[PDB]
Amino acid sequence: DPILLRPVDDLELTVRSANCLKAEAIHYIGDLVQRTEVELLKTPNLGKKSLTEIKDVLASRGLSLGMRLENWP
């Protein structure tokens, strides 16, 4: 995919969610769509609004959660 390999800078997030991802260490968009709702919601400093606008931008640019991967990278 062109965008599934796009790093989490393109996700149009803040620095709160940016450091959430750094604590998770996910870069590509296929990687961020790997995880689920609650598995990321359980991390520090990461509540409902963070993952909420996460899924917001996901659905705005054709993404969502519950997704899965095979041989990525």
């Binding site: 800078d9 393109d10 640019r61």
Partner: protein, 51 residues
């Protein structure tokens, strides 16, 4: 920048019109510029560079 107005104002001029110190307006301008760098944006602006 002089966009859509007669003159391009100093940062202190714009600060006095907005009632803020130069450093705040400098950070604001840098924030806007940084946001405009952001890919998923400025694709066409990049297209306006021919070389």
């Amino acid at each position: 920048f002089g966009i859509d107005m007669n003159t391009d104002y100093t940062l202190e001029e714009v600060g006095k019109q907005f009632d803020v110190t130069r450093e705040r307006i400098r950070q604001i301008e840098a924030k806007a510029l940084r946001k405009l760098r952001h890919p998923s944006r400025s694709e066409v602006l990049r297209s306006f560079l021919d070389d």
